[PDB]
From a paper:
UPF0201 family proteins constitute one such uncharacterized, archaeal specific protein family. The UPF0201 family proteins occur as a single globular α/β domain with approximate dimensions of 55×35×35 Å3.
The polypeptide chains of 10077a and 10077b extend beyond the C-terminal helix, α5, for about 20 residues, and form a type IV turn followed by random coil. Pairwise sequence identities among the structures we report herein range between 15–22%, with exception of 10077a and 10077b, which are 35% identical. Our four UPF0201 structures represent subfamilies N149845 (10077a, b) and N130963 (10077c, d). The crystallographic asymmetric units contain one protomer in 10077c, two in 10077b and four protomers in both 10077a and 10077d. While 10077a, 10077b and 10077d all form one type of dimer (typeI), 10077c forms altogether different dimer via crystallographic symmetry (typeII). The interface surface area for type I dimers in 10077a, 10077b and 10077d are 672, 563 and 611 Å2, respectively. In type I the turn connecting β1 and helix α2 (residues Thr13-Asp15) assemble closely to form a two stranded β-sheet.
Author numbering:
A (entry chain C): 2 to 72, 79 to 97, 102 to 125
B (entry chain A): 2 to 134
The structure:
């Protein structure tokens, strides 16, 4: 498992509130911020742990909802929900879980969203 | 004339940056911040001056766009439209709602003002980028 995280930071945003939103869901992520033109910016991170995510889908009873969005895999989490510690699917936090050559993404999907 | 302004502040936004985006377009606005749910908030305020807005439309040379947007949101004694919050942050006027909500603007004409005259005054027609009346 390798998790690729990307989040944009608009001029009116607090880069660190965005960072916190990410970590709330992927606490293990190694994140770096890239500056851009006209006050825009972005966070690019990576992590190998989907534990907090799993813990939230369960603790929030949305395993099936997640299962559906997941079916490597890429999806978007709602930044504002992630900020208050919640997992939500409806730019957002770009997430891409990619199973190494010797794994099946589906099996990863079932371990994450039973 | 009277301008009503409302701008949401999302959880990951810095309320002071949203407030400055408003002031960059409406310098005289009196603003108040109210808290909502799940870390959301909102700025509300008013001003009787559209002087800065008028300068920016001329400076950016986007009178033609402004005129169309103002007429489209026009009613009997008012007109409304949104401003891009990110463009506003850097001192620019843009009418597309940004990913974060934009700034909702309502210009109200008083009983002795004609709303269409307010609009012609703010965003006058042009012929070659040069104002008419």
């Amino acid at each position: 498992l390798e998790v690729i995280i990307k989040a944009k930071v608009k001029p009116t945003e607090d880069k660190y509130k965005v960072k916190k939103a990410i970590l709330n869901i992927f606490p293990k992520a190694k994140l770096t911020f890239i500056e851009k033109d006209n006050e825009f910016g972005e966070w690019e991170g990576k992590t190998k742990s989907v534990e907090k995510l799993k813990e939230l889908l369960r603790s929030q009873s949305i395993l099936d909802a997640a299962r559906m969005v997941l079916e490597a895999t890429k999806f978007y989490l709602n930044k504002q929900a992630a900020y208050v510690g919640a997992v939500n699917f409806d730019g957002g936090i770009f997430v891409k879980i990619l199973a190494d050559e010797n794994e099946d993404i589906m099996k990863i999907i079932k371990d994450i969203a039973p």
